[PDB]
Write an enzyme that holds these catalytic residues in place. Sequence first.
Site: not given
Lengths: 71, 510, 160, 51, 51, 309, 466
Positions: G162, G188-189
């Site tokens: 990533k 998202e979180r």
Amino acid sequence: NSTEISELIKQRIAQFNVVSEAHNEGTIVSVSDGVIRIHGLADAMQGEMISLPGNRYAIALNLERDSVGAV
Amino acid sequence: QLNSTEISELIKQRIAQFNVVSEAHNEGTIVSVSDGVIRIHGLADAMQGEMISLPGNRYAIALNLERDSVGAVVMGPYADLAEGMKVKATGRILEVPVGRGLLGRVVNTLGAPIDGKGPLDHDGFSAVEAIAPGVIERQSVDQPVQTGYKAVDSMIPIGRGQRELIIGDRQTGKTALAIDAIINQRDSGIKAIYVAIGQKASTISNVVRKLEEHGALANTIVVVATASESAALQYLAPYAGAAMGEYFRDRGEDALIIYDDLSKQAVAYRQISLLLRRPPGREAFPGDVFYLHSRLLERAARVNAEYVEAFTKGEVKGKTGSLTALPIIETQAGDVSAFVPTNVISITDGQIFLETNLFNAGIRPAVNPGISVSRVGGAAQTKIMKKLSGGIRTALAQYRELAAFSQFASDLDDATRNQLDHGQKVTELLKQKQYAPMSVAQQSLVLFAAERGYLADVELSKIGSFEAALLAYVDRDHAPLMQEINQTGGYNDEIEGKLKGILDSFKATQ
Amino acid sequence: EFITVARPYAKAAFDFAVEHQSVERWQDMLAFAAEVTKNEQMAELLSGALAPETLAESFIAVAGEQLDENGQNLIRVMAENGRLNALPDVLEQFIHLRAVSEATAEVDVISAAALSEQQLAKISAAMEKRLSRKVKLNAKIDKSVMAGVIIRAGDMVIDG
Amino acid sequence: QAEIEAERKRAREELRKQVAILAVAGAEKIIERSVDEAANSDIVDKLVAEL
Amino acid sequence: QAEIEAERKRAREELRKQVAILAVAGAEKIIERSVDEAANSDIVDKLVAEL
Amino acid sequence: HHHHHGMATGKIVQVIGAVVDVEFPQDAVPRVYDALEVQNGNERLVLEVQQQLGGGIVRTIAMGSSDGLRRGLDVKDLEHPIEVPVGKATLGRIMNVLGEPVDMKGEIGEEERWAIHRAAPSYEELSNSQELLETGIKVIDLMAPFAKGGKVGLFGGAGVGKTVNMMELIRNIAIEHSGYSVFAGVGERTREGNDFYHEMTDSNVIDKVSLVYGQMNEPPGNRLRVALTGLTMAEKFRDEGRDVLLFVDNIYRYTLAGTEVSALLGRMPSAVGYQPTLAEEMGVLQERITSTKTGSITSVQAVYVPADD
Amino acid sequence: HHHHHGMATGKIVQVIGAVVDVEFPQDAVPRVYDALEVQNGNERLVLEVQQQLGGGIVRTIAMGSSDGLRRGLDVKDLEHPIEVPVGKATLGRIMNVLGEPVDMKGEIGEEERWAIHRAAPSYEELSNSQELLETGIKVIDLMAPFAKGGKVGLFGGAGVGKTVNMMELIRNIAIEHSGYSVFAGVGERTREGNDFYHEMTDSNVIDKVSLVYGQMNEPPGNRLRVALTGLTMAEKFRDEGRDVLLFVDNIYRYTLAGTEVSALLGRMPSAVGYQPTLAEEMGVLQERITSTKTGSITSVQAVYVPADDLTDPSPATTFAHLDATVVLSRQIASLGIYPAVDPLDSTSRQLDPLVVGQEHYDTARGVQSILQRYQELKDIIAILGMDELSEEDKLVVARARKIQRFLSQPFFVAEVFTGSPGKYVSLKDTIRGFKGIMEGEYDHLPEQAFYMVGSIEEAVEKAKKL
Ligand SMILES: Nc1ncnc2c1ncn2[C@@H]1O[C@H](COP(=O)(O)OP(=O)(O)OP(=O)(O)O)[C@@H](O)[C@H]1O
């Protein structure tokens, strides 16, 4: 005269004080080859046979007001 | 300096005009508008399917003309419309250009506005639908078929009057792959069509650039169709994109009709039928798949003199109006097992099925072995590709069946080792590549090396380039009369003498 | 709000019930009985009844009671069968359907509703609309005459 | 290249001409908005007496 | 193609300059034709003052 | 297709789709087979009333189309129900789906004009012994004892074909037994009629068989209505002295048209994509080809199964 | 749509959850999807009326849940359009889903009055053309080229590198090509917001990049309504003169949110839960994965498809739209490598001879023949005996190993990510260092000198130091 009935629409909408539908006979509203609604028949028994036009024992399905389903 | 002719046409047209109407005439009033389904409460006693134009360039047709309100057809924007614009009185319905005068340019959904000109007129602005031909006057003419494949030109050909249900495999390729028919066939001389079903910029730019730059441009029509169409352009491409085909098949000339994939045609009309509470059955479609395929797939037939003697209104009664049914489809990895696939593929003549295993692995063989077959076969073509070039089932079934079962059963004898070199060398060296043009030299080169014994001496893969280039260039350059053998039938003294002398001298002198 | 149930009440009362000189009782009984419950008292107070004798006898015999056999029979049959809950198109459906034998009404010439007495095609519309008298009113009659040539010439010649 | 240059010059010259929208918008807006002057009762008789 | 791009750009610029220089003649001819053929009042009293 | 006597009825109401909801007469409705020849457009498009209703708007279904009609098309009353033209003189040319022709002129031999709805199964005067037949072959009669006037099924793929059965059965069965062997066809191709008919010029059967095929360019009601021509035309020769022998094509037109038309009309029926009228049409039509006292009624049961379903 | 108030008022008869029986005044509504900003209880809720049956009484739905108000809400629409805050100078801040602050920072830097104007290029532009700019890499830039503003849909599982995509793509899409970039923050979180905000803000992936937002806690309309704001806010920076870069969330959010939102609401549901209308918007994707007349909206898609697949329904459309494939696993990074990118499993789709040439098509034959011959010859000899090593097996463990395995290099701006920053490579290093040095050019060439080199050209010239 909500429903189109010609005779029953003008007679029922113009003279509702005289019904006279307790003879357990009358006629039929429609006939869709089997599914025929017997008009009237207020004092008729539910499920009893009745000789209609010809030679057939037409028995009603249920006694839902005056709209009984004759077969 | 820039107007010149615009002042005369604008001054004459803007100064002449006509009169003033809209007085004591019911033009139809829309009750509501549910984004497309506009309940037009008025002008319901008209034609069944009258596409009356409302406010703008549209074609609102009567979807369900009842005793009061009737639904309208959406033709473009309909989400921003409200309930107050009403409609307009219009009696025109299905006004498209039909004729052979505009067969060749880039056509659109309702006309020819996809090209740079746009003024491609035809013979007459009539209807866009097409009906079936004669029942007893459907005399099919057995003509030669030369697309672009070197192996499919003599295996199963379809001339005129045949319906071959082609099934294109996905992932290289269904939209192109064997698109060498226009470049290899040169001038077709027929009124062929190319109806699309969801194009884009790469398909129109690559197809319009490669079609006009690699082959003949003005030779066949092409009905373009965008991906933003609802049901009046995407679902009506096969039923409305057969106008020009009715201009040559009913007069005495040759015509053809080809469509795109069957997913957008059968799936585009399923949303308007199920979203308006109508009838449904197989994939949100009741009996719409059987009625649309009868006047499209079974309508392109080669007429004779009785069917064209009255439809041409006195023209070419002595000629036979041929019409080739090129019904192709793009199968999603063998996605053909519904009612439209079995009824449309089984109701026609031929059904060619192609898999993506032989084409998605790096080989040049796009068609499958034994799964792609037509109806007329190789007997309807020339004489050299009928009795001398027609044994794909023997070499494919014998080489594949005798060479595929060699894992647990080894130790091949003389009957199994002879099919591997001839089947693998002939099938791997005689197959056309991607975008490869094939002329009429497939019968002379395929009916000599794979019949006498010229290909048995050079069964290696490295000798195919030197033997094929040296023998083909030396034999084709040292004798120009042999090409004349490709101008007709053959299979006589010139084929045996020219094939034996050219194959023996070219194969022995290389 | 009968729509499909409005053809029987307007077509069945203008033929069999027209022989008893009921041309004026339908307008006063239908307009008074249908228009008397258009507020926020008789509609919500009479439409939520349990039986049909209280709503039909009270709503048809308590607010003026200007009816006879057609009002009591039509109000009892329509109220007991389910037709007296709205009745908004009784005057237009009964007047337009019952007055179809001598209906004479034209259209508008991009101005106002003149409603000429033309029973047939091009009857009195040519003399009444072309024999001034009145030629142009204040409802944009003369100003709307250039919409055809201006909209046709500008819209048809706007492409170039 | 010559056909692409001729098609690009013809498409750019035929599509870049703003005389249709400019002349139609200016002539239609100026003629439709400037018609109220010198039109008292003479323009109503010729447009209303022809019915 | 690179040598023809300059001729195509020069032809497009010449067409745009010719249309821009002809916008006065097109606006004047459209204003005179619309004012003289507006089907209302043949009078060129109100100036359009177009480009 | 009925004998019009009076030409009155009334106007119409709604005309959305194939549902012919025309308001004809009030208390004077017709029968089931008595169609109303309405003047929709230019031709007289008749619609068979499948279910009568009160008021006038009955549930009728037409065969073809109205060719562009308005909301108030004028209808016409009839008297004789299902009055088409047929008889025993149909063995000479190709027939259509309404008693007319498809090849030359003459309406496939114009002769009698009785009721198109023939009787299905009956007894009393019918032959109840069920005698056996003999085609006159060593691999058809000696290996399978067929009955005189039965519906023998067929299976398998190719091999024999229509030329072997039509050419071999149009000369041996025609000379070995007195009778006229006709044929039918529902759900064929548009080009086969321009080729298979040529076989009639190679065996001389066109003068002794009535080819009644509907092809497949029409809809369900216009192409699946070939049952009245076979039953109405085959009863004139089997009940006179000869023996009729029809020949069906497939079951895709009757099964797809019956299941799709009977299940797509807004009513529930059978399961597994079937309709509830399969037992009445299959049982009533399968038992009608029986032996009688005036001639055996034979029919080639050439039904196609749905891939062994 | 509707901005912002006026048109008299309204009266709600029946109040429900999302799709309620909204009814305004007599002829006082607007067009389709008119977000009427009315005071529904306390906050000003915007209920978009998708239907238009009559005038006023239409089916309205908001971005969340309107269950809680009484039977009598005053719904008032407007007449103008809802102009969202978008423009070209919005890069560098953290924008929200509706046009506000995401992480309590700056909102939209430019207000061009964008009223959901979805820009789509037609056939009168630069369609189509190929980009193939710098990165800088060799096998990733030459073996997997991209189009001019195309949707490069990748595919990978867990642990596919990533940091190499954001670190290697954060400098090439903000200094090499165009400086205007954007990023999608929908779905998202805590780990996505903290890792994406800290990793993207601690390097060079925040400025200048318009970071969007969007949480899937309420309905799927606000979290899945990225077509107007995404296609009108990220693609609006390409009209200034240069191109424009953007990001994506996941491929399952469109089908899951569109099918669940379109099927769980009642209306628009006839394809067994699938939406037959929204899928038509996919037909406009060809108008967004190409170069326009003013710029090129380079919408870099994420590694997401049908439940993490590479050859499924949604995965076949993303790989066929670009000029390369989509395959990324842990086999490349499991043997000790920096960039987790497969070279033999991710081949170029346009590696033929007609749309390439000798120098353009020569890089695919050396990488494919050197990778297949080196992997098959090295695996066959290494999985058996060392005595069966001729020339390709004995010589493919030096030239083909370092040349075919020298693509694992660092990022162009890895000053606080991978430690050392790699140099910018071009197209001449892959063809010049892979079209002749992969078979036997410098004879002795180990893999130690080509393990940290940013280009393949240094794999054969700098082999004297090992
Ligand atoms: N048999 C084959 N062998 C090698 N290459 C092939 C073969 N068939 C097609 N191709 C290649 O495929 C390309 C055309 O692909 P095409 O556009 O038809 O794919 P597609 O049908 O759009 O794919 P999908 O059906 O998945 O959308 C051509 O450039 C050609 O080189």
